Symmetry: C3
Subunit: 282 residues, 3 copies
Amino acid sequence: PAQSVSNLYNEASGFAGNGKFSFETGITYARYDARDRIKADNWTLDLTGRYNLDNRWQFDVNVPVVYRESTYQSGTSEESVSRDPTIGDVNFGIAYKFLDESATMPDAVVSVRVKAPTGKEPFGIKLMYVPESLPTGNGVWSITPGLSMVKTFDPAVLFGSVSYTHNLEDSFDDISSDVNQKVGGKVRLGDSFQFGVGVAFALNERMSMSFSVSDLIQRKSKLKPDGGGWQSIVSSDANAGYFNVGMTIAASENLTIVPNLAIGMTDDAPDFTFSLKFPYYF
Amino acid sequence: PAQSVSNLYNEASGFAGNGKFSFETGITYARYDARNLDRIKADNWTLDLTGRYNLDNRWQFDVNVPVVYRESTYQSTSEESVSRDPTIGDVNFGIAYKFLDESATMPDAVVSVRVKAPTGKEPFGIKLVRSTANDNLYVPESLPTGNGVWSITPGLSMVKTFDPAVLFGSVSYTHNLEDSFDDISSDVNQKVGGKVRLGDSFQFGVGVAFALNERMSMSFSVSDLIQRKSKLKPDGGGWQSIVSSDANAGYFNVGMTIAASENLTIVPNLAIGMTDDAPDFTFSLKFPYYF
Amino acid sequence: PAQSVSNLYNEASGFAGNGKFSFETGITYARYDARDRIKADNWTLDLTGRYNLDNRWQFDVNVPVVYRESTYQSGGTSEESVSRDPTIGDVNFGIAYKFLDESATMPDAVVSVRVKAPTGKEPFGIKLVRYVPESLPTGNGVWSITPGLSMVKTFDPAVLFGSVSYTHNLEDSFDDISSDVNQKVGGKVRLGDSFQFGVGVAFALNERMSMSFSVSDLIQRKSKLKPDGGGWQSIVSSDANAGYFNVGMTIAASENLTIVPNLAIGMTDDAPDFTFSLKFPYYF
Ligand SMILES: CCCCCCCCCCCC[N+](C)(C)[O-]
Ligand SMILES: CCCCCCCCCCCC[N+](C)(C)[O-]
């Protein structure tokens, strides 16, 4: 099977099939904005290991490193806060390919992914103007099952995916933004679901190009301060649309370059995200 | 023959030169986010029911009924929401005439007009009810479903093949008719009758498309609609225009056409809003069944 | 050959091979809808002359003509409009040199310089009245020099391309650097410098037509003022980030004439919401 074809499937399905072991290195820049104003610049380095078994099972571990740099403007006045390279919410996932593509069926793949609360929690960080530090994960355990369907209708390859996320309830020693007090509390982050569709083409032996779209929807998040009852956090629910354009480029027989632009379609998504990924196959 | 070519043309022109009678079902989602009041989020679902009759690749007649479902959140801090369970929208109908057949030097041209009737729930006389939590947060008592008036919209389409790429374009404009109402205030304490005149508007856009294979097509296109501002005239006052009622709504579109079985087509389309007067995005799926 | 390939290269690289003299007329419409709401509609007619010397050197001069309409609404609602009838902008000119020719392993490489004179109406003199300006500028008021670089390369049927440049602005000075009607302050200005890059991909659809997808960013550093008083100062929100996503075509109308439609979608708040353009290079 051509090289371009193998890589279109790997990018689309999340399943690195032709091969056994792989280490992926990702670099990603994203950019946010607002009215006061508020610029932000996020760099993330992804490190990923993957073990693929017979092209039927797959296991992966993932470690993000996060450098961040924000600006809060309000007055005449402008002020920065930043965050030198730290982890990261660490996560692993398992995947099973249950249908292999035939003339009637597609390539179907079910998966699970568990994310641990290893980064710097937002809750308990203190403060017009301005935070003491920037977080690097959400502070909670989460578990996300999902599904990928992929199929070739020569020369198109259509693909899609759906997934939902459950966050587990968790408690914090401090829950207050106010520098003076220290209140502790429980948190139920709202569940969420995600989906996307797209089309791709093998342009030649080594290159492929992809168009796609996805939307993420985040249910409302509730809080329990010590003493009081439950209550929902206003403005906490979200809708983050993305339109994506992408390529795939075979460098060696084992190296691939994967560039991707992702244009935020709503306010809840960053303005744009350029990304760059380098899977290596031993 | 075609049949991706044929599907592609029906989409680009708005003219099913193919068969005779057909019936299109459409579902469409659209997200809004805006910014007294601080932000207003909105989820809009629409089911379209459309019947059309094509005649000899020369005339076409069409009827459309939208069913509308909307949900809207009003933030100030605190927050409240409001709904509209499936009611009908502005029913409308359309005539079109193919005045140029495509050739080695001329395109497919199609002149047409579309008339729209105020069957939906209008926005005039819907009251702002202050809650009940934020104390200077005003929230509408119900949500509208059409714009309360009649309108006529003539328009034109041009389509030409330059193998393998099919260019296309279109222009139209909407004249709205003046109407009167028992109540046009949104104050719960007062009732003020009046007449209203919505701003007329014009739309245009261009695109390209391709037959990827015997059964699929893909397209890219762009558009802009521009709207003159609207006016109200209480009794017995004079016409006053309303600031911010003017608009410019630009859209960028990716779409496909997929032939499921000769009778059925599936037509997915993403429209990305480029301006604040357009919704942020709009997915849609349409299912023309050909009898 | 083909013409589709040639037109496509001229568009990615900014460098017309395959001709001697040429004249380009371009028309651009841009839409701003910002934050108080400053809504604005700009058109620009661009007139450009071009001389390529043996597919090696090239000299261009460009004259922009600029029409504007802005509209400001109350806040600290009622609208008020301002406009600026056709008026010459920031005349510029550039030289270019192709240092690598495309082979089985080499890209097509062009190095270049663009010099921009301050021939348009400067922003600094202009006065606020009431809270709205009594006119609109047509350029930025300073000299600037801009070296650039570009690469293009076929990997059949894909043509990959990319480019990068920076702009250095030259410190200047003005009789009036204020906008308060009741005050006339002299001073000296350093417009912040900037770094532009973008990348992209393009395909020949047939012997006449090409299609293009690309993206680019512009990063601008902060501007500074020195009043007569008086030492240097940062203007607080003068820095910028303007990102863009582009879809385009080239159509071969005839042997001499290409039509170039381009849509550019603003992705950040420091960019027009959108921009349409048509260009008509004519090759004598
Ligand atoms: C970034 C917004 C959320 C995108 C949602 C995409 C669905 C995730 C499905 C998991 C399967 C893996 N893969 C690569 C197809 O995404
Ligand atoms: C400012 C430069 C403008 C270009 C000058 C106009 C030249 C007119 C000649 C038109 C050519 C017609 N033709 C090819 C049939 O000869």
